[PDB]
Design a protein around this ligand. Structure first.
Ligand SMILES: C[C@@H]1COCCN1c1cc(-c2ccc3c(N)[nH]nc3c2)nc(N)n1
Length: 277
């Protein structure tokens, strides 16, 4: 194993992201010219806010992930005040940037990028890990325009908290729980947003959004691709045991076999060339 890295090992540059308890900065490792997204955390603030379990959860999950559709944790170190996590640099940034940029995706891009997310969730769920806060903001795009999912402090490992309002599953609002199905609900929202250009549950504030969620109060624009629409209806189901892809629905086989994915080769998505946006 290589030595423990230190801040002097890098030339830091721009801020790539900001969270409540962290900041992600682009850094070039001097010895290699390699670029990394270094997530920087202030020890005192983490302790002060009782966030140690989250940071720990992230380091632990992101270390064990070994799949192209995920941001990778490459190393950690600290100084007197700070924790540094060396992450994959996803040069093209957030999927959200692209939804905004181009408005809404065509069927080819929707199908392709949905398939990668699905293929990612299949990997994640196979390891007994639930993201819990999946969204266009943490589904990033690398230089080659393949997805790289990040942001795992709120993940749960199978053998309390609430994600972003638009993507919160109903089980979370009605009994504090989360299952793999919760990610499949997030997926349903994300497909809707790729197609429609907006998340399906929208309102003046969080309360109102939550209220629409528990009543399943949303609907499709006219232009929505019919197969996409049908797929979204199989995901946005109040009963979590009845979402396509969950264990009670017999998993990812039936999900991947949905007619929306007719033209997908599931086997080597990462090797395929993404459709142009
Ligand atoms: C600060 C944000 C929001 O707040 C919660 C914690 N978040 C993150 C953010 C990133 C992140 C962001 C941009 C990136 C890029 N361009 N390449 N890699 C990146 C990794 N990675 C993790 N793990 N968590």
């Amino acid at each position: 194993q290589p030595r423990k890295k230190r801040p002097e090992d890098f030339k830091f540059g721009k801020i790539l992201g900001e969270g409540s308890f962290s900041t992600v900065v682009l850094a070039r490792e001097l010895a290699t010219s390699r670029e990394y997204a270094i997530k920087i955390l202030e020890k005192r603030h983490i302790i002060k806010e009782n966030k140690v379990p989250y940071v720990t959860r992230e380091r632990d999950v992101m270390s064990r992930l070994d799949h192209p559709f995920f941001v990778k944790l490459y190393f950690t170190f600290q100084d007197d005040e700070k924790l540094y996590f060396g992450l994959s640099y996803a040069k093209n940034g957030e999927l959200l940037k692209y939804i905004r940029k181009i408005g809404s995706f065509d069927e080819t891009c929707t199908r392709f990028y949905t398939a990668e997310i699905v293929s990612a969730l299949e990997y994640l769920h196979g390891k007994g890990i639930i993201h819990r806060d999946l969204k266009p903001e943490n589904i990033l795009l690398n230089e080659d325009m393949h997805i790289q999912i990040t942001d795992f402090g709120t993940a749960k490992v199978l053998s309390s908290f609430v994600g972003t309002a638009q993507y919160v599953s109903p089980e979370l609002l009605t009994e504090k729980s989360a299952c793999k199905s919760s990610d499949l609900w997030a997926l349903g929202c994300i497909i809707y947003q790729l197609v429609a250009g907006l998340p399906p549950f929208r309102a003046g504030n969080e309360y109102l959004i939550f209220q629409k969620i528990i009543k399943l109060e949303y609907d499709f624009p006219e232009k929505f691709f019919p197969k996409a629409r049908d797929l979204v209806e199989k995901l946005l189901v109040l009963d979590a045991t009845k979402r396509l892809g969950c264990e009670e629905m017999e998993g990812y086989g039936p999900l991947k076999a949905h007619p929306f994915f007719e033209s997908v080769t599931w086997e080597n998505l990462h090797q395929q060339t993404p459709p142009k946006l």
